[PDB]
Amino acid sequence: SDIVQQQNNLLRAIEAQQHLLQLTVWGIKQLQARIL
Amino acid sequence: SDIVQQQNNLLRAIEAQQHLLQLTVWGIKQLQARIL
Amino acid sequence: SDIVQQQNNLLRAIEAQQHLLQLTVWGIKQLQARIL
Amino acid sequence: WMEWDREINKYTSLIHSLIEQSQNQQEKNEQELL
Amino acid sequence: WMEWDREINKYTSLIHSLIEQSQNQQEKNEQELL
Amino acid sequence: WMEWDREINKYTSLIHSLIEQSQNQQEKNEQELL
Ligand SMILES: [Cl-]
Ligand SMILES: [Cl-]
């Protein structure tokens, strides 16, 4: 039970980190469009 | 078995995210070089 | 035991990934002022 | 930048697939606890 | 960019909270195993 | 930016080590299923 709970925790962390990654990709693309 | 399968899933996610992270580092360095 | 150890491994990887994500956010913010 | 765009797309797609796979496995694992 | 800033703050706070929760759960898990 | 570069390198080396450790542990765990 507690191992499965910990997997839920880490998956949630990965999901949140993916949102951050998508944000950084968006930001770089905007800057690239402008400084080119 | 199914817990170990999930650990494989999560490790693969972490590895792919790290690839994407390294791509963003490349992008930042390129833009920095162009500006500064 | 070996499953618990692997959860610690993945948790630590996620932590290191988070430091790198925070660094990339810093870089984007530094560039954003200049390029806009 | 063209190669960069391609690689961003490929890895974005892969991560999405892995997260979906992980979500499905998580639900299966939680059911199996019972 | 205003929304971007807002979302960076939201997800950073959430990840920090999830990491803390996971650290706590890892400690409890090790205690249980011992 | 010199500090930024150093920090990127340090955390990249750390996560690579952790990923390698995790890959090895994963291989062992999968074999232990038998
Ligand atoms: Cl796990
Ligand atoms: Cl500088």
From Swiss-Prot, chains D, E, F:
UniProt feature coiled coil, ranges: 6-33
Subcellular locations according to the entry: Virion membrane; Host cell membrane; Host endosome membrane
Highest taxon of source: Viruses
Subunit description: The mature envelope protein (Env) consists of a homotrimer of non-covalently associated gp120-gp41 heterodimers. The resulting complex protrudes from the virus surface as a spike. There seems to be as few as 10 spikes on the average virion.
Mode of membrane association: Single-pass type I membrane protein
Descriptive protein name: Transmembrane protein gp41
Annotated glycosylation sites: 10
Function: Acts as a class I viral fusion protein. Under the current model, the protein has at least 3 conformational states: pre-fusion native state, pre-hairpin intermediate state, and post-fusion hairpin state. During fusion of viral and target intracellular membranes, the coiled coil regions (heptad repeats) assume a trimer-of-hairpins structure, positioning the fusion peptide in close proximity to the C-terminal region of the ectodomain. The formation of this structure appears to drive apposition and subsequent fusion of viral and target cell membranes.
